[PDB]
Amino acid sequence: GSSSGLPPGWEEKQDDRGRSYYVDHNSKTTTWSKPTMQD
């Protein structure tokens, strides 16, 4: 807990092609998705 932005266990970083992707450490899988906002 420290503000909010990335889900628990998500790394935001660029791939070989140089695009910012996200990887979920929960299942351990790279998934290029844009995190939704629930407010």
Binding site: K13, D15, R17, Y21, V23, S27, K28, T29, T30, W32
Partner: peptide, 14 residues
């Protein structure tokens, strides 16, 4: 399949 299909490279390489 409990794991999501990876589209961009980097993780696990390929």
């Amino acid at each position: 399949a409990p794991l999501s299909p990876m589209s961009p490279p980097g993780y696990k390489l390929v």
